[PDB]
Paper text:
Comparison of the BovI-StlN-ter Dutϕ11 complex with the structures of both proteins alone showed that complex formation induces modest changes, mainly in Stl, indicating that their structural conformations in solution are competent for interaction. BovI-StlN-ter binds primarily to Dutϕ11 through interactions with residues conforming the Dut active centre, precluding the binding of the nucleotide and the consequent motif V positioning. Further examination of the Stl–Dutϕ11 interaction showed that BovI-Stl inserts the helix α8 and the α8–α9 connecting loop (Lα8α9) into the Dutϕ11 active centre, mimicking the interactions mediated by the substrate with catalytic residues on the conserved motifs of trimeric Duts. Thus, Stl residues Y112 and Y113 place at the positions occupied by the nucleotide ribose and pyrimidine ring, respectively, with Y112 interacting with the catalytic residues D81 and Y84 on the conserved motif III. Stl residue Y105 is placed in the position occupied by the dUTP γ-P and residue Y106 is hydrogen bound with the side-chains of Dutϕ11 residues H21 and D24 at the beginning of motif I. In the opposite part of the active centre, Stl residue Y116 in Lα8α9 is inserted between the Dut conserved catalytic motif IV and the phage-specific motif VI, interacting with Dutϕ11 K131 from the former motif and with I110 from the second. Consequently, this short region of Stl occupies the Dut active centre and contacts residues from all the conserved catalytic motifs with the exception of motif V, which remains disordered in the Dutϕ11–Stl complex. In addition, the R74 and D77 residues from Stl helix α5, which connect the HTH and middle domain, are also involved in Stl–Dut recognition, forming a secondary, albeit more modest, area of interaction. In this area of interaction, residues R74 and D77 form salt bridges with Dutϕ11 residues preceding the Dut motif I, E18 and R15, respectively.
The Staphylococcus aureus pathogenicity islands (SaPIs) are the prototypical members of the phage-inducible chromosomal island (PICI) family of mobile genetic elements. Stl is a DNA-binding protein that binds to the intergenic promoter region between stl and str (the SaPI transcription rightward regulator), preventing transcription of the str and downstream genes, thus maintaining integration of the island in the host chromosome. The remarkable ability of the SaPIbov1 Stl to target unrelated but functionally similar antirepressor proteins relies on the modularity of this repressor.
Residue numbers in the entry:
A (entry chain G), B (entry chain G), C (entry chain G): 2 to 156
D (entry chain H), E (entry chain H), F (entry chain H): 9 to 153
The structure:
Amino acid sequence: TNTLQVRLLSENARMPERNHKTDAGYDIFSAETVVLEPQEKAVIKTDVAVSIPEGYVGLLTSRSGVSSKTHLVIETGKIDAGYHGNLGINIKNDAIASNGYITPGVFDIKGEIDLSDAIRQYGTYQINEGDKLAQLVIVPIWTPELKQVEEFESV
Amino acid sequence: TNTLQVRLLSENARMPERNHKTDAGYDIFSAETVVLEPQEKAVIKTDVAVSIPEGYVGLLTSRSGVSSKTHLVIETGKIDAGYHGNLGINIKNDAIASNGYITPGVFDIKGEIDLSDAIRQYGTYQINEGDKLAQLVIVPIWTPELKQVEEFESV
Amino acid sequence: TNTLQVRLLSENARMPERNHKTDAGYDIFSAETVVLEPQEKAVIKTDVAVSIPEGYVGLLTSRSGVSSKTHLVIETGKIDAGYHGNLGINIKNDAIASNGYITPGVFDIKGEIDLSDAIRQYGTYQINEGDKLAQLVIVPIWTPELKQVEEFESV
Amino acid sequence: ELPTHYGTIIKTLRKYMKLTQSKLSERTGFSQNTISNHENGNRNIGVNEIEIYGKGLGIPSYILHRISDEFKEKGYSPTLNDFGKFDKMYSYVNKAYYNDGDIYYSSYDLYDETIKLLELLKESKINVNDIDYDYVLKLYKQILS
Amino acid sequence: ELPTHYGTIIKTLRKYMKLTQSKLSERTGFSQNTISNHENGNRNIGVNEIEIYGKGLGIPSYILHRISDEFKEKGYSPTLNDFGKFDKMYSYVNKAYYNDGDIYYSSYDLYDETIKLLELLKESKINVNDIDYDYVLKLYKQILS
Amino acid sequence: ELPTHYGTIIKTLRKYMKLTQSKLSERTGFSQNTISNHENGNRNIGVNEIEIYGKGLGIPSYILHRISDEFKEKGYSPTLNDFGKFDKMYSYVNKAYYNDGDIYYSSYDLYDETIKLLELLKESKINVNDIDYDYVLKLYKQILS
Ligand SMILES: [Mg+2]
Ligand code: NI
Ligand code: NI
Ligand code: NI
């Protein structure tokens, strides 16, 4: 039917966005504000849910500007058909803490630095509610029955 | 024909597992016991082989519970149609070693710590034979002939 | 029509290569020489452009020999249909710098060490023009219209 | 050839699902003679045959192998013995995994997790029949932190 | 139900694209009465309806939401006011993203980036109509380093 | 337009595969006149034409470019000269890559790896014809550690 059903789970949720009908993916937005010091990990809530149809998988994955200009690393999540809960973005700040070096500055998702409320390790990121953090790409799948064999054989 | 042929290469091999006909992937099991100190890398044997049919690629990839609650990082392997050898999981422990800190404790694939036979750097993982480490997702592919052009042109 | 259009953007560009008609991907070559000390990042130019047809996405991704025998980490780029610029490989050297340890040696893409012109941190890689760094895998995609719903409902 | 205790596993399961040897054959496509021999320990059963029994029983095949692993570690299967409780709890657990982010992204193994939830209840003399989804969900999140 | 200022956003946009209420309906499939009520502030508009207006106007839907976000931060939309300039600049910006590696791999948000380019021009009293693609491209790379 | 030494590469290869200029045309779809001019150095050959010769010769096209790269580094191609040995060895190497995990996950370039295996044999005066798959496999793993 060529439509994807979407649930907005809160007032902080943003409907996913697309530029161009031909684009591979839908940009996905953080619903919360998160501070990650170096080597810190989190799963970041979007307050969005989707219904991937049978025969597909959803790929929740990174964007070139974010991953090449920051140390934020996103591990591609595989969304099953029928997972209907809150979509989460699986993230690590893979900067390394440098000896001492402490600072009131925090980096953002564009690689820029501003001034924060506290003293932390140099290299800390702060993700904001509304940051355009990831994308969703949906691809078809093959899901066969398994057969054990002693030797492989022609189809 | 909608069946996938599988070879069990040893008595430590486990047949891949699936919950639900609609699930994207087949869970894949370690056939060996491996200790990885921080920043250590290995390709971990499964003692399983598969025959991916022509027109597809197999994706040997991570699971959300493992990658979000441990420092074990899996690099998605691309399995060609016609690769018939032992499937390997490409893994790094991306914890960083903290100064001294040494310990007899080792972390497992659930993020928990137990007591080991030796003294090692704090942050060391131990993977056990039978650990549910990765999944296999199979997707169709386009494999065209290449044409060089001076300028792009409409299809 | 089963052909992929390719533009060679310079004399350092190499036409992508494939062994076997059934192989998942096309090997992709660096067009430049780049030194990456530990934790250093770059987007490495190939001087190649492609025209991915509508309904697909191109995946610019790693090779098993490179990622399992070096610390070079490649983040899979998603190439949109209609992106016609220079293809770039998104790379980090994820070795950690060890205290002092400095050296005139640099590691290559095979994990081997040779002698360089300068003194740098132990763990530095040098990528050469013509290195077989990545592959390109092209998969079909679903690109539906979005519908907001209060509750999910059967298709 | 798989171990012979698979015969007991299939018989006891067939009985639990309220199916006759004839009705199972109707869904599996085995001969009634083959089924009886399978359960009696006559014929050894193969891995591919276990996949077919699972489909006919309406149980995920991997669960039969997990039961068998219990036979090998001890000499019997507590899970098989109290399969009714496992059924009830496994259903809550699946509903949680596919509907709650805290479970979906943290879970390691739904079967082992079902068993730890039952074992926790048993240790506090609580009956599975006298509790609901929301109680399990709160507990399940506790064991995943 | 979306805010009522969406009515103004759709009217002003409809007018900019040189379309009549009847002609928009012909492309959207709404009733002329529905469109008028939408613009007048009678009917509230839904998110799904905004997706349809976008398609009919030949404007990416997300842009309407960004304009609305300007209404909420200030009390009006500079972008909506100078939409002709935004159109011109957004087109250069898109041509750059899909044809130049330095833009494609570094860009964070094409809309915000279009606006920073306009704001830079305004601060140096330069008219968008008197410059070309190559001037914008050089500047755009500057703001992405 | 590609270098003219490609003409020699295609002639010598055509001859090695025991094919006539007429029979190659039958598989490639070039004119016999075109083929002769290609080999003689009359017509320059394009990259797209090299893809077609490869298919007709039953050789992966990239190999022709690698041979040409040998021409450019030295002034001749050792590989082309001893192409029969390269053929034999490249076949072992491919069988190893697609059937053994140690090769599949460690290999960097099958062509360069085929050549290092031949060069090692030559340095110890060993004849490629007098050894088997298992000897090569052991050696190949040695050069990948
Ligand atoms: Mg790291
Ligand atoms: Ni059940
Ligand atoms: Ni526009
Ligand atoms: Ni050959």
